[PDB]
Symmetry: C2
Subunit: 58 residues, 2 copies
């Protein structure tokens, strides 16, 4: 299920025990986001993530 909420610029969301996702700013329909996560946790834009999955399948 998808958790849907609101975050204003400057506000943060905590995922799990070590990850944070912060809205750093908004420009039209563009959102500048800051993700802080432990070294072991990878963070990728979806377009990159998809290619990674496709290449891990070989």
């Amino acid at each position: 299920s998808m958790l849907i909420l609101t975050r204003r610029v400057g506000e943060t969301l905590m995922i799990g025990d070590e990850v944070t996702v912060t809205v750093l700013g908004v420009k039209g329909n563009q959102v500048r986001i800051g993700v802080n996560a432990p070294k072991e946790v990878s963070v990728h834009r979806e377009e990159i993530y998809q290619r990674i999955q496709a290449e891990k399948s070989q």
Copy 2:
């Protein structure tokens, strides 16, 4: 930990690990509507709310 700064337009998504996704659902002024997909056992908290909970022990 490390910091990653990126841009996501409404409708775009980012992945954290292999089980979590964050999607920008909309923008109204300075507020952003966000959709988060995570496994049942992964807590999702608004930082300012979690801090209050922590404070009240």
